[PDB]
Design a protein around this ligand. Sequence first.
Ligand SMILES: O=c1ccn([C@H]2C[C@H](O)[C@@H](COP(=O)(O)O)O2)c(=O)[nH]1
Ligand SMILES: O=c1ccn([C@H]2C[C@H](O)[C@@H](COP(=O)(O)O)O2)c(=O)[nH]1
Ligand SMILES: [Mg+2]
Lengths: 263, 257
Amino acid sequence: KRARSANIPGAILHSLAELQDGLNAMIDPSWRAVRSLDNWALAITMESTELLDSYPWKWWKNLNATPDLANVRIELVDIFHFSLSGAMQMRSTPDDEIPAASLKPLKEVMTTFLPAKECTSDPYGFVFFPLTDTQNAIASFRNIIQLANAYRFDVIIECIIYAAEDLGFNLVAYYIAKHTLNCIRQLSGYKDGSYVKVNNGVEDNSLLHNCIKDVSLDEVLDADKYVQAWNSIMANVYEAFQIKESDRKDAERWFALAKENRL
Amino acid sequence: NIPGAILHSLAELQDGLNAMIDPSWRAVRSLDNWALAITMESTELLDSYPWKWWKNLNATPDLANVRIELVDIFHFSLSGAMQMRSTPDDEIPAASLKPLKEVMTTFLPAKECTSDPYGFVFFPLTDTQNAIASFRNIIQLANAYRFDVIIECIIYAAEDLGFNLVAYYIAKHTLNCIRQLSGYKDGSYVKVNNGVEDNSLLHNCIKDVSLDEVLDADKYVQAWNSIMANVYEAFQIKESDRKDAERWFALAKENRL
Ligand SMILES: O=c1ccn([C@H]2C[C@H](O)[C@@H](COP(=O)(O)O)O2)c(=O)[nH]1
Ligand SMILES: O=c1ccn([C@H]2C[C@H](O)[C@@H](COP(=O)(O)O)O2)c(=O)[nH]1
Ligand SMILES: [Mg+2]
C-alpha cells in the first residue's frame, strides 16, 4: 500500500488550473488577452522579495528576529497562483509572441545562487533546504526571480511544491483557502479600495491557517475525496468571512465554468 | 551628472556610515549582501507604483517614495562598488566580468520611449510600465554585481524625475546615522508608526537645494553640512550627537591606514 508523495498529479493540477482561470476571470473576463507574460513574472518577482522579507535578512536592524514562517506559507501560495497563471498563459500564447528568453538554454539566462553552508536542494538545484534557514531562503528566491525572468513558470511550480514539503504544510489545501479569500476580496471592493484586509486587528490571510487544520495530504489529492475536501475548505473560508450562500461557489461550479469557457 | 570627484566623496560618507553599523564591514559583508539589498529596494521602489491589476486601480505613483528608494539603492550600490574594489581578484565573481549582453535579458516597455545610454532605464519614470522594465533590469544588474552601471542608471533616473540625487543622499545618509544612534539595531527606534514614516520628513529638509550647491567640487562640503544640520534639526538631535561632513571624511581617511 504505497504512500502518495508531494507531487501534484496531472489531473489535480488541471482542476487547480480551472479554479485559477475562474479567479483570473473574476478579475478580467478576457484575462488571457489582457494580461502579458511579463505581468506574471513581475508578480512572482514582487512576491518573492515579499517572502524574503519574512526572514531577518537585514544586518543593520532587528537582530534576534526569527523567520515569520506563517507568512512564508501564504507567500508561497501567492507565488503558486501567479506561476500557475503564467504556465497557463504560456500555453495560450501564439508562437510568434513567444519571448526568445523562454527558449534559450537556462544557463545562458541565469546564474544559480548557492548558499555557503552545505545543504540539500530540490531536483533542479534551485531551492535549498531547510527553508527555516534565511541564507537557504535567500539563495532560493533569488533563483526564483531569475526563473521568472526566463518565463520558466512550470519549473517554478515544481520548486514551490518541494518548498511546501520542506516547510511541512499542505500546499494544495492552502491554495484552496487563499483562492477562496481572493474571490472574497474581488466580491468586496478590492479594486475600488473599499476592502479592509487588516480588520479588527488581524490580517485576513492569518485566518486561513485555521481553515485547513483538518485536511490531509492524501485527502486533498485523492481522486475519490478531493472535491469534497476542497469544498469543506472553501466553506470554512466563506463562513469565516461571513459570506452569504448566494455569493459562494463550489469546486464543481468552477469546473463547469471552465468547461463552458472551452467552447 | 555627478562629477567623478563628488562620487569619490560620497563613497567616503558611505564608508563611514557602513563602519558605524559594523567596524570591519568590508570583511564582514559579502558582494551578495549588497546585490540582495538592491534587489529588495528595487521591488520596494516598484511597489510605489500602481502595478496591481486586481487591487487599488486608481492609485497614484508615489514618486516622493521613489526618490527615497532611488537613494537607498544608491547607498547599497556605492557599498557594492567599494566591496568589489577590495575583493581579491581570485574571489571576483565571474559574472561581473562578462559582457552585459551575456548576463541579462533587457526588458523593454511596450510603448516607445527614451532611455539612458545603456538602454536599461526608461523615461518618463512617471509611467508605471517604464518603471517596471527599468527595475527588472536593475535587479539583473545586481545579480551580475554591476554596481557601477547601477550608479550610472540611478543618476539618469534622478535626472529624468527632476530631483537632486546628491541632496537626497546626504539627507537619507543623515537619517541612517540618526537611526543607528537611536537604537535601530535592537528595536528602540522604529522607522514607521501611526502613519508617520521617518523618510517622509526628509523632503522638506532639502526642497530649496540647488544642483549647483551640492555638486560644486569647490563649495559642496558646506552645502552637505547645511543639509546634515537641517535633518538633525528636523529630528531634534542634540549637537554632541551630530557629525559633520569633515568628521566622516576624517573618519574615512584615518581608517585607510
Ligand atoms: O490575476 C490575478 C491577480 C491576483 N491573483 C492573486 C494571486 C495571489 O494569491 C493574490 C495576491 O494578492 P495580494 O494578497 O498580494 O493582494 O492575488 C490572481 O490569482 N490572479
Ligand atoms: O550597511 C548598510 C546597511 C543599511 N544602509 C542604509 C541604506 C538605506 O538607505 C537604508 C535602508 O534602511 P531601511 O529603510 O530598509 O530600514 O539603510 C547602509 O547604508 N549601509
Ligand atoms: Mg527604503
